[PDB]
Protein backbone atom coordinates (compact mmCIF):
# COMPACT_ATOMS: atom_id res chain seq x y z
CA UNK A 1 0.00 0.00 0.00
CA UNK A 2 1.17 3.52 -0.92
CA UNK A 3 -0.61 6.87 -1.48
CA UNK A 4 -2.66 6.52 -4.69
CA UNK A 5 -4.12 9.72 -6.19
CA UNK A 6 -6.45 9.78 -9.17
CA UNK A 7 -5.42 11.93 -12.16
CA UNK A 8 -8.42 11.93 -14.52
CA UNK A 9 -11.40 9.78 -15.50
CA UNK A 10 -13.23 9.90 -18.83
CA UNK A 11 -16.18 8.29 -20.55
CA UNK A 12 -15.39 7.06 -24.03
CA UNK A 13 -17.69 5.21 -26.42
CA UNK A 14 -18.01 3.08 -29.56
CA UNK A 15 -20.79 2.45 -32.07
CA UNK A 16 -23.08 -0.47 -32.83
CA UNK A 17 -26.49 -0.88 -34.46
CA UNK A 18 -29.03 0.34 -31.92
CA UNK A 19 -26.88 2.80 -30.05
CA UNK A 20 -23.51 3.51 -28.50
CA UNK A 21 -21.91 1.25 -25.93
CA UNK A 22 -19.45 2.73 -23.45
CA UNK A 23 -16.33 2.45 -21.36
CA UNK A 24 -14.58 4.58 -18.73
CA UNK A 25 -10.90 5.38 -18.30
CA UNK A 26 -8.72 5.85 -15.26
CA UNK A 27 -5.28 7.42 -15.21
CA UNK A 28 -3.78 6.99 -11.77
CA UNK A 29 -0.56 7.71 -9.86
CA UNK A 30 0.80 6.12 -6.67
CA UNK A 31 3.57 6.82 -4.17
CA UNK A 32 4.61 6.45 -0.55
CA UNK A 33 6.55 9.74 -0.86
CA UNK A 34 10.06 8.34 -0.44
CA UNK A 35 11.07 8.24 -4.09
CA UNK A 36 8.75 5.51 -5.30
CA UNK A 37 5.91 6.03 -7.77
CA UNK A 38 3.94 4.21 -10.43
CA UNK A 39 1.62 5.28 -13.22
CA UNK A 40 -1.28 3.11 -14.27
CA UNK A 41 -4.05 3.42 -16.82
CA UNK A 42 -7.30 1.50 -16.34
CA UNK A 43 -10.20 0.87 -18.70
CA UNK A 44 -13.39 -0.88 -17.57
CA UNK A 45 -17.22 -1.16 -18.11
CA UNK A 46 -17.75 0.98 -15.02
CA UNK A 47 -16.33 3.96 -13.10
CA UNK A 48 -15.24 2.21 -9.86
CA UNK A 49 -13.87 -0.94 -11.51
CA UNK A 50 -11.74 1.24 -13.78
CA UNK A 51 -10.42 3.25 -10.85
CA UNK A 52 -9.61 -0.08 -9.22
CA UNK A 53 -7.61 -1.45 -12.17
CA UNK A 54 -5.83 1.91 -12.09
CA UNK A 55 -3.97 1.24 -8.85
CA UNK A 56 -3.38 -2.39 -9.77
CA UNK A 57 -1.22 -1.60 -12.84
CA UNK A 58 -0.03 1.49 -10.97
CA UNK A 59 1.72 -0.65 -8.37
CA UNK A 60 2.71 -3.12 -11.09
CA UNK A 61 4.91 -0.56 -12.88
CA UNK A 62 6.77 1.83 -10.57
CA UNK A 63 10.04 3.77 -10.49
CA UNK A 64 12.91 4.74 -8.18
CA UNK A 65 12.89 8.53 -7.99
CA UNK A 66 16.32 9.51 -6.66
CA UNK A 67 15.37 12.56 -4.57
CA UNK A 68 17.77 15.00 -2.93
CA UNK A 69 16.87 17.66 -0.37
CA UNK A 70 13.35 16.90 -1.53
CA UNK A 71 14.01 18.19 -5.04
CA UNK A 72 15.68 16.42 -8.00
CA UNK A 73 19.22 15.52 -9.21
CA UNK A 74 19.51 17.11 -12.67
CA UNK A 75 17.44 19.06 -15.21
CA UNK A 76 15.93 17.03 -18.06
CA UNK A 77 13.55 17.28 -20.98
CA UNK A 78 11.62 14.41 -22.53
CA UNK A 79 9.29 14.10 -25.49
CA UNK A 80 6.66 11.38 -25.50
CA UNK A 81 5.44 11.55 -29.08
CA UNK A 82 3.88 15.00 -29.37
CA UNK A 83 3.91 15.89 -25.70
CA UNK A 84 7.09 17.31 -24.15
CA UNK A 85 7.94 17.94 -20.49
CA UNK A 86 10.60 19.95 -18.73
CA UNK A 87 11.71 19.17 -15.17
CA UNK A 88 14.06 21.69 -13.55
CA UNK A 89 15.21 21.37 -9.89
CA UNK A 90 14.54 24.17 -7.39
CA UNK A 91 16.13 25.16 -4.07
CA UNK A 92 14.47 24.10 -0.79
CA UNK A 93 11.31 26.11 -0.30
CA UNK A 94 9.87 26.81 -3.74
CA UNK A 95 6.88 24.59 -4.33
CA UNK A 96 5.85 21.96 -6.84
CA UNK A 97 4.85 24.10 -9.84
CA UNK A 98 3.16 22.07 -12.58
CA UNK A 99 -0.15 21.11 -14.13
CA UNK A 100 -2.41 18.66 -12.32
CA UNK A 101 -0.90 15.72 -14.22
CA UNK A 102 2.81 16.37 -13.63
CA UNK A 103 2.25 17.77 -10.14
CA UNK A 104 0.16 14.84 -8.91
CA UNK A 105 2.73 12.40 -10.26
CA UNK A 106 5.47 14.59 -8.74
CA UNK A 107 3.98 14.86 -5.24
CA UNK A 108 3.70 11.18 -4.40
CA UNK A 109 7.14 10.81 -5.94
CA UNK A 110 8.21 13.02 -3.05
CA UNK A 111 9.43 16.23 -4.67
CA UNK A 112 8.60 19.52 -2.96
CA UNK A 113 10.82 21.90 -4.90
CA UNK A 114 10.66 21.48 -8.69
CA UNK A 115 10.17 23.76 -11.75
CA UNK A 116 8.10 22.16 -14.52
CA UNK A 117 6.91 23.15 -18.01
CA UNK A 118 4.36 21.33 -20.14
CA UNK A 119 5.25 21.83 -23.81
CA UNK A 120 3.93 20.16 -26.92
CA UNK A 121 0.68 18.21 -26.89
CA UNK A 122 -0.91 18.67 -23.50
CA UNK A 123 -2.82 15.37 -23.69
CA UNK A 124 -3.32 14.50 -19.99
CA UNK A 125 -2.66 10.85 -20.59
CA UNK A 126 0.44 11.51 -22.68
CA UNK A 127 1.85 14.09 -20.31
CA UNK A 128 1.75 11.55 -17.53
CA UNK A 129 3.42 8.87 -19.65
CA UNK A 130 5.99 11.57 -20.39
CA UNK A 131 6.59 12.64 -16.79
CA UNK A 132 7.46 9.06 -15.85
CA UNK A 133 10.08 8.40 -18.52
CA UNK A 134 11.53 11.67 -17.31
CA UNK A 135 12.02 10.45 -13.76
CA UNK A 136 12.99 7.02 -15.02
CA UNK A 137 15.97 8.75 -16.65
CA UNK A 138 17.15 10.57 -13.55
CA UNK A 139 20.82 10.21 -12.47
CA UNK A 140 22.85 11.06 -9.35
CA UNK A 141 26.56 11.92 -9.11
CA UNK A 142 26.89 8.33 -7.97
CA UNK A 143 25.39 6.23 -10.76
CA UNK A 144 26.91 8.82 -13.05
CA UNK A 145 30.60 8.14 -12.33
CA UNK A 146 29.56 4.55 -11.61
CA UNK A 147 29.50 4.21 -15.42
CA UNK A 148 32.74 6.13 -15.87
CA UNK A 149 34.75 3.53 -13.96
CA UNK A 150 36.89 1.31 -16.20
CA UNK B 1 35.11 -35.57 -24.68
CA UNK B 2 32.85 -32.67 -25.74
CA UNK B 3 34.95 -31.35 -28.68
CA UNK B 4 34.75 -34.61 -30.62
CA UNK B 5 31.12 -35.29 -29.68
CA UNK B 6 29.66 -31.95 -30.74
CA UNK B 7 31.91 -31.48 -33.76
CA UNK B 8 30.97 -35.07 -34.66
CA UNK B 9 27.50 -34.09 -35.83
CA UNK B 10 26.21 -31.25 -33.61
CA UNK B 11 27.48 -27.92 -35.02
CA UNK B 12 26.85 -25.65 -38.00
CA UNK B 13 23.22 -24.95 -38.94
CA UNK B 14 20.97 -22.40 -40.67
CA UNK B 15 22.30 -20.72 -43.83
CA UNK B 16 21.70 -17.23 -45.31
CA UNK B 17 18.55 -16.79 -43.23
CA UNK B 18 20.72 -15.60 -40.39
CA UNK B 19 20.57 -12.58 -38.13
CA UNK B 20 23.83 -10.54 -38.11
CA UNK B 21 23.80 -10.11 -34.31
CA UNK B 22 24.73 -13.81 -34.06
CA UNK B 23 27.94 -13.36 -36.09
CA UNK B 24 30.37 -13.29 -33.17
CA UNK B 25 29.21 -16.89 -32.96
CA UNK B 26 30.21 -18.11 -36.40
CA UNK B 27 33.37 -19.29 -38.14
CA UNK B 28 32.42 -19.27 -41.84
CA UNK B 29 30.13 -20.41 -44.66
CA UNK B 30 31.08 -23.84 -46.01
CA UNK B 31 29.16 -24.89 -49.13
CA UNK B 32 26.57 -22.24 -48.27
CA UNK B 33 25.80 -23.30 -44.72
CA UNK B 34 26.71 -21.16 -41.71
CA UNK B 35 29.12 -23.27 -39.63
CA UNK B 36 29.35 -21.94 -36.08
CA UNK B 37 32.57 -21.64 -34.10
CA UNK B 38 32.26 -24.50 -31.62
CA UNK B 39 35.30 -23.31 -29.65
CA UNK B 40 33.23 -20.31 -28.59
CA UNK B 41 30.29 -22.64 -27.97
CA UNK B 42 32.29 -24.23 -25.16
CA UNK B 43 33.22 -20.97 -23.41
CA UNK B 44 29.45 -20.38 -23.63
CA UNK B 45 28.35 -23.88 -22.69
CA UNK B 46 30.57 -23.31 -19.66
CA UNK B 47 29.05 -20.16 -18.17
CA UNK B 48 25.60 -21.55 -19.07
CA UNK B 49 26.22 -24.70 -17.04
CA UNK B 50 27.99 -22.52 -14.45
CA UNK B 51 24.45 -21.15 -14.10
CA UNK B 52 22.49 -24.39 -14.45
CA UNK B 53 24.64 -25.95 -11.71
CA UNK B 54 24.48 -22.95 -9.36
CA UNK B 55 20.71 -23.49 -9.58
CA UNK B 56 20.62 -27.28 -9.56
CA UNK B 57 22.48 -27.35 -6.24
CA UNK B 58 20.01 -24.84 -4.79
CA UNK B 59 16.81 -26.64 -5.77
CA UNK B 60 15.17 -24.18 -8.15
CA UNK B 61 12.95 -25.50 -10.95
CA UNK B 62 13.41 -25.02 -14.71
CA UNK B 63 10.73 -24.87 -17.43
CA UNK B 64 11.86 -26.60 -20.61
CA UNK B 65 10.10 -25.88 -23.89
CA UNK B 66 10.24 -27.36 -27.36
CA UNK B 67 7.26 -27.25 -29.68
CA UNK B 68 8.99 -28.33 -32.89
CA UNK B 69 8.67 -31.96 -34.00
CA UNK B 70 12.40 -32.39 -34.69
CA UNK B 71 12.95 -31.50 -31.03
CA UNK B 72 9.71 -32.42 -29.26
CA UNK B 73 9.96 -35.94 -27.83
CA UNK B 74 13.58 -35.37 -26.73
CA UNK B 75 12.36 -32.76 -24.28
CA UNK B 76 9.56 -34.95 -22.93
CA UNK B 77 12.25 -37.42 -21.88
CA UNK B 78 15.04 -35.28 -20.41
CA UNK B 79 12.35 -33.43 -18.46
CA UNK B 80 10.62 -36.43 -16.92
CA UNK B 81 14.15 -37.75 -16.39
CA UNK B 82 14.95 -34.74 -14.19
CA UNK B 83 11.50 -34.00 -12.77
CA UNK B 84 11.20 -30.64 -14.50
CA UNK B 85 8.05 -29.07 -15.97
CA UNK B 86 8.03 -28.77 -19.73
CA UNK B 87 5.96 -27.74 -22.73
CA UNK B 88 5.83 -30.20 -25.60
CA UNK B 89 2.66 -29.16 -27.42
CA UNK B 90 1.37 -25.71 -28.36
CA UNK B 91 3.01 -23.35 -25.86
CA UNK B 92 -0.18 -21.49 -24.98
CA UNK B 93 0.09 -17.79 -24.22
CA UNK B 94 0.23 -16.04 -20.89
CA UNK B 95 1.04 -19.36 -19.26
CA UNK B 96 3.62 -17.44 -17.22
CA UNK B 97 2.51 -13.81 -17.35
CA UNK B 98 -1.08 -14.93 -16.89
CA UNK B 99 -0.24 -17.73 -14.46
CA UNK B 100 -3.01 -17.27 -11.89
CA UNK B 101 -5.38 -18.31 -14.70
CA UNK B 102 -3.76 -21.03 -16.79
CA UNK B 103 -3.28 -22.72 -13.43
CA UNK B 104 -7.08 -22.73 -13.33
CA UNK B 105 -6.96 -25.23 -16.20
CA UNK B 106 -4.49 -27.42 -14.29
CA UNK B 107 -6.83 -27.31 -11.29
CA UNK B 108 -9.33 -28.34 -13.96
CA UNK B 109 -7.26 -31.35 -14.99
CA UNK B 110 -7.18 -32.74 -11.46
CA UNK B 111 -10.87 -31.88 -11.14
CA UNK B 112 -11.42 -34.65 -13.69
CA UNK B 113 -8.48 -36.75 -12.51
CA UNK B 114 -10.28 -37.40 -9.21
CA UNK B 115 -13.78 -37.71 -10.61
CA UNK B 116 -12.21 -40.33 -12.87
CA UNK B 117 -11.89 -43.00 -10.20
CA UNK B 118 -15.27 -42.47 -8.50
CA UNK B 119 -18.89 -43.73 -8.09
CA UNK B 120 -20.35 -40.61 -9.75
CA UNK B 121 -19.92 -42.06 -13.23
CA UNK B 122 -22.59 -44.64 -12.45
CA UNK B 123 -24.71 -41.71 -13.59
CA UNK B 124 -23.72 -38.72 -15.73
CA UNK B 125 -25.45 -39.33 -19.10
CA UNK B 126 -23.42 -40.38 -22.17
CA UNK B 127 -23.43 -36.66 -23.07
CA UNK B 128 -21.23 -35.89 -20.04
CA UNK B 129 -19.13 -39.05 -20.35
CA UNK B 130 -17.79 -38.53 -23.88
CA UNK B 131 -17.52 -34.89 -22.83
CA UNK B 132 -15.80 -35.12 -19.44
CA UNK B 133 -13.53 -37.78 -20.99
CA UNK B 134 -12.53 -35.65 -23.97
CA UNK B 135 -12.18 -32.55 -21.77
CA UNK B 136 -9.68 -34.56 -19.75
CA UNK B 137 -8.06 -35.90 -22.91
CA UNK B 138 -6.94 -32.52 -24.28
CA UNK B 139 -6.56 -31.15 -20.76
CA UNK B 140 -3.95 -33.84 -20.28
CA UNK B 141 -2.85 -33.28 -23.89
CA UNK B 142 -1.22 -29.86 -23.40
CA UNK B 143 -0.64 -30.03 -19.64
CA UNK B 144 1.35 -33.29 -19.58
CA UNK B 145 4.40 -31.41 -18.36
CA UNK B 146 3.06 -28.03 -17.34
CA UNK B 147 1.86 -28.77 -13.82
CA UNK B 148 4.75 -29.82 -11.65
CA UNK B 149 5.68 -26.57 -9.95
CA UNK B 150 2.75 -24.26 -9.23
CA UNK B 151 5.27 -21.43 -9.11
CA UNK B 152 7.23 -19.36 -11.61
CA UNK B 153 10.35 -21.26 -12.81
CA UNK B 154 13.51 -19.42 -11.72
CA UNK B 155 14.61 -20.05 -15.31
CA UNK B 156 13.62 -21.52 -18.68
CA UNK B 157 15.59 -23.74 -21.06
CA UNK B 158 14.52 -23.99 -24.68
CA UNK B 159 15.54 -25.16 -28.16
CA UNK B 160 14.86 -22.47 -30.80
CA UNK B 161 14.38 -19.17 -28.93
CA UNK B 162 12.97 -17.42 -32.00
CA UNK B 163 10.67 -20.38 -32.67
CA UNK B 164 9.16 -19.94 -29.18
CA UNK B 165 9.88 -16.22 -28.92
CA UNK B 166 6.44 -15.71 -27.37
CA UNK B 167 7.59 -17.65 -24.31
CA UNK B 168 10.96 -15.92 -24.29
CA UNK B 169 9.03 -12.65 -24.10
CA UNK B 170 6.86 -13.76 -21.21
CA UNK B 171 9.92 -14.75 -19.19
CA UNK B 172 11.79 -11.67 -20.26
CA UNK B 173 8.94 -9.48 -18.95
CA UNK B 174 8.87 -11.48 -15.70
CA UNK B 175 12.60 -11.08 -14.97
CA UNK B 176 13.17 -14.79 -15.42
CA UNK B 177 16.59 -16.05 -16.52
CA UNK B 178 16.38 -17.45 -20.03
CA UNK B 179 18.55 -20.33 -21.14
CA UNK B 180 18.27 -21.74 -24.64
CA UNK B 181 19.97 -23.41 -27.61
CA UNK B 182 19.91 -20.91 -30.47
CA UNK B 183 21.31 -21.32 -33.98
CA UNK B 184 22.07 -18.54 -36.49
CA UNK B 185 18.30 -18.28 -37.03
CA UNK B 186 18.19 -16.62 -33.61
CA UNK B 187 19.29 -13.34 -32.07
CA UNK B 188 21.65 -13.61 -29.08
CA UNK B 189 21.24 -10.30 -27.22
CA UNK B 190 17.78 -11.23 -25.81
CA UNK B 191 19.06 -14.45 -24.23
CA UNK B 192 20.59 -14.50 -20.74
CA UNK B 193 22.23 -17.93 -21.10
CA UNK B 194 22.98 -19.03 -24.63
CA UNK B 195 23.64 -22.42 -26.20
CA UNK B 196 24.98 -21.71 -29.72
CA UNK B 197 24.64 -24.64 -32.14
CA UNK B 198 22.33 -26.73 -34.34
CA UNK B 199 18.58 -26.54 -33.62
CA UNK B 200 16.97 -28.92 -36.14
CA UNK B 201 18.97 -32.14 -36.63
CA UNK B 202 17.95 -34.27 -33.65
CA UNK B 203 21.67 -34.88 -33.10
CA UNK B 204 22.83 -31.70 -31.36
CA UNK B 205 19.50 -31.43 -29.53
CA UNK B 206 20.00 -34.74 -27.72
CA UNK B 207 23.70 -34.16 -27.13
CA UNK B 208 23.07 -30.77 -25.48
CA UNK B 209 19.83 -31.64 -23.72
CA UNK B 210 21.33 -34.84 -22.34
CA UNK B 211 24.41 -33.29 -20.69
CA UNK B 212 22.11 -30.44 -19.70
CA UNK B 213 19.89 -32.81 -17.71
CA UNK B 214 23.07 -34.75 -16.86
CA UNK B 215 24.39 -31.66 -15.06
CA UNK B 216 20.95 -31.24 -13.46
CA UNK B 217 21.04 -34.45 -11.46
CA UNK B 218 24.73 -33.98 -10.69
CA UNK B 219 23.65 -31.76 -7.79
CA UNK B 220 21.06 -34.08 -6.29
CA UNK B 221 22.56 -37.56 -6.62
CA UNK B 222 21.68 -40.33 -9.06
CA UNK B 223 24.43 -40.36 -11.69
CA UNK B 224 22.99 -42.71 -14.32
CA UNK B 225 23.36 -43.74 -17.96
CA UNK B 226 21.88 -41.63 -20.80
CA UNK B 227 18.11 -41.58 -21.40
CA UNK B 228 16.04 -42.99 -24.32
CA UNK B 229 17.21 -41.40 -27.58
CA UNK B 230 17.92 -43.99 -30.30
CA UNK B 231 14.89 -45.89 -31.61
CA UNK B 232 14.74 -44.45 -35.12
CA UNK B 233 17.45 -41.80 -34.80
CA UNK B 234 18.29 -41.90 -38.53
Amino acid sequence: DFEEKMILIRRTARMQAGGRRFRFGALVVVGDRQGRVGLGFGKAPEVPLAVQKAGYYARRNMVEVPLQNGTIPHEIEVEFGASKIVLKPAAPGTGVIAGAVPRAILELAGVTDILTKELGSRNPINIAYATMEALRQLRTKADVERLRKG
Amino acid sequence: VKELLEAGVHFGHERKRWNPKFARYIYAERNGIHIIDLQKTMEELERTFRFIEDLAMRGGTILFVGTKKQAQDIVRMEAERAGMPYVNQRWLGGMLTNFKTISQRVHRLEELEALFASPEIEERPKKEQVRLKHELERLQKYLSGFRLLKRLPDAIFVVDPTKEAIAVREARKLFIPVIALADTDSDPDLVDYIIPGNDDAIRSIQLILSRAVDLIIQARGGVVEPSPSYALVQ
Binding site: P73, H74, E75, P89, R139, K141, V144, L147, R148, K149, G150 | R169, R172, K173, F175, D189, L190, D192
Partner: protein
Protein backbone atom coordinates in the same frame (compact mmCIF):
# COMPACT_ATOMS: atom_id res chain seq x y z
CA UNK C 1 32.82 17.11 -48.48
CA UNK C 2 32.11 17.44 -44.75
CA UNK C 3 31.33 21.02 -43.83
CA UNK C 4 32.27 20.65 -40.16
CA UNK C 5 34.36 17.52 -39.41
CA UNK C 6 33.95 17.84 -35.65
CA UNK C 7 30.16 17.78 -35.78
CA UNK C 8 30.73 14.81 -38.06
CA UNK C 9 32.91 12.96 -35.56
CA UNK C 10 30.49 13.56 -32.75
CA UNK C 11 27.74 12.13 -34.93
CA UNK C 12 29.96 9.20 -35.98
CA UNK C 13 30.09 8.34 -32.30
CA UNK C 14 26.45 9.14 -31.59
CA UNK C 15 25.53 6.65 -34.33
CA UNK C 16 28.02 4.02 -33.20
CA UNK C 17 26.82 3.70 -29.64
CA UNK C 18 23.19 3.63 -30.76
CA UNK C 19 23.80 -0.06 -31.57
CA UNK C 20 26.75 -0.59 -29.21
CA UNK C 21 29.69 -0.98 -31.55
CA UNK C 22 33.27 -1.74 -30.48
CA UNK C 23 35.19 1.13 -32.06
CA UNK C 24 34.71 3.56 -34.91
CA UNK C 25 37.25 5.29 -37.11
CA UNK C 26 36.65 8.99 -37.66
CA UNK C 27 39.22 10.46 -40.06
CA UNK C 28 42.21 11.73 -38.08
CA UNK C 29 42.91 15.28 -36.90
CA UNK C 30 44.98 16.93 -34.18
CA UNK C 31 41.97 18.91 -33.01
CA UNK C 32 39.72 15.84 -33.08
CA UNK C 33 42.31 13.96 -31.06
CA UNK C 34 42.49 16.87 -28.62
CA UNK C 35 38.73 16.53 -28.27
CA UNK C 36 38.75 12.74 -28.08
CA UNK C 37 41.42 12.95 -25.35
CA UNK C 38 38.93 14.71 -23.10
CA UNK C 39 36.37 12.00 -23.77
CA UNK C 40 38.88 9.50 -22.40
CA UNK C 41 40.59 11.68 -19.79
CA UNK C 42 37.01 12.22 -18.56
CA UNK C 43 35.90 8.68 -19.38
CA UNK C 44 33.25 8.52 -22.12
CA UNK C 45 35.47 6.07 -23.95
CA UNK C 46 38.20 3.50 -23.35
CA UNK C 47 40.12 5.84 -25.62
CA UNK C 48 41.41 6.19 -29.17
CA UNK C 49 44.45 5.26 -31.25
CA UNK C 50 45.91 6.29 -34.61
CA UNK C 51 45.39 3.89 -37.52
CA UNK C 52 45.31 3.68 -41.34
CA UNK C 53 43.03 2.51 -44.18
CA UNK C 54 45.36 2.85 -47.20
CA UNK C 55 47.81 5.60 -46.27
CA UNK C 56 44.67 7.23 -44.93
CA UNK C 57 44.71 8.03 -41.16
CA UNK C 58 41.47 7.64 -39.20
CA UNK C 59 41.13 7.22 -35.41
CA UNK C 60 39.98 3.98 -33.73
CA UNK C 61 37.75 5.20 -30.89
CA UNK C 62 36.54 2.52 -28.48
CA UNK C 63 33.12 3.17 -26.98
CA UNK C 64 31.99 2.49 -23.41
CA UNK C 65 28.53 1.29 -22.38
CA UNK C 66 26.84 0.28 -19.13
CA UNK C 67 25.93 -3.06 -17.54
CA UNK C 68 23.57 -5.46 -19.30
CA UNK C 69 20.03 -5.29 -17.90
CA UNK C 70 17.17 -7.37 -16.56
CA UNK C 71 13.70 -7.30 -18.09
CA UNK C 72 12.88 -6.85 -21.79
CA UNK C 73 15.21 -4.86 -24.06
CA UNK C 74 18.19 -6.08 -22.00
CA UNK C 75 20.40 -3.66 -23.95
CA UNK C 76 22.82 -1.78 -21.66
CA UNK C 77 22.69 1.90 -20.79
CA UNK C 78 25.35 4.17 -22.27
CA UNK C 79 28.18 6.30 -20.99
CA UNK C 80 27.48 8.72 -23.81
CA UNK C 81 23.74 9.33 -23.65
CA UNK C 82 23.69 12.67 -25.41
CA UNK C 83 26.33 14.45 -27.49
CA UNK C 84 25.53 17.51 -29.61
CA UNK C 85 27.63 20.32 -31.09
CA UNK C 86 27.08 23.83 -29.74
CA UNK C 87 29.03 26.41 -31.72
CA UNK C 88 28.38 25.46 -35.35
CA UNK C 89 30.00 26.30 -38.71
CA UNK C 90 27.06 28.59 -39.44
CA UNK C 91 26.66 30.19 -36.01
CA UNK C 92 29.92 30.39 -34.13
CA UNK C 93 29.24 30.46 -30.36
CA UNK C 94 31.66 32.17 -27.98
CA UNK C 95 31.55 32.78 -24.22
CA UNK C 96 33.32 34.82 -21.59
CA UNK C 97 34.33 32.81 -18.57
CA UNK C 98 31.26 33.96 -16.64
CA UNK C 99 28.88 32.83 -19.36
CA UNK C 100 30.22 29.28 -19.52
CA UNK C 101 27.40 26.67 -19.28
CA UNK C 102 26.88 24.25 -16.38
CA UNK C 103 26.01 21.03 -18.19
CA UNK C 104 23.31 18.81 -16.79
CA UNK C 105 23.81 20.23 -13.29
CA UNK C 106 27.44 19.18 -12.75
CA UNK C 107 26.75 15.68 -14.15
CA UNK C 108 27.83 16.50 -17.71
CA UNK C 109 30.64 18.25 -19.53
CA UNK C 110 30.93 21.06 -22.10
CA UNK C 111 34.11 20.67 -24.16
CA UNK C 112 35.29 23.94 -25.67
CA UNK C 113 38.32 25.33 -27.53
CA UNK C 114 40.42 28.13 -26.07
CA UNK C 115 43.53 30.32 -26.41
CA UNK C 116 45.28 27.96 -23.98
CA UNK C 117 44.16 24.46 -25.03
CA UNK C 118 40.85 22.61 -25.40
CA UNK C 119 39.48 22.86 -21.84
CA UNK C 120 36.08 21.84 -20.43
CA UNK C 121 33.52 23.62 -18.27
CA UNK C 122 35.18 23.00 -14.89
CA UNK C 123 38.60 23.06 -16.58
CA UNK C 124 38.22 26.50 -18.12
CA UNK C 125 36.14 28.01 -15.28
CA UNK C 126 38.97 27.09 -12.93
CA UNK C 127 41.75 27.93 -15.40
CA UNK C 128 40.03 31.31 -15.56
CA UNK C 129 39.27 31.54 -19.30
CA UNK C 130 36.64 31.20 -22.02
CA UNK C 131 36.51 30.42 -25.72
CA UNK C 132 34.51 28.75 -28.45
CA UNK C 133 31.99 26.43 -26.83
CA UNK C 134 32.63 23.25 -28.85
CA UNK C 135 29.94 20.86 -27.67
CA UNK C 136 28.10 19.32 -24.73
CA UNK C 137 28.51 15.70 -23.64
CA UNK C 138 26.85 13.50 -21.01
Amino acid sequence: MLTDPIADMLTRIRNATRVYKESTDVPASRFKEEILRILAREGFIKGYERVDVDGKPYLRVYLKYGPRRQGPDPRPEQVIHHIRRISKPGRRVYVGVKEIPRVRRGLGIAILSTSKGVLTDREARKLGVGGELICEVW
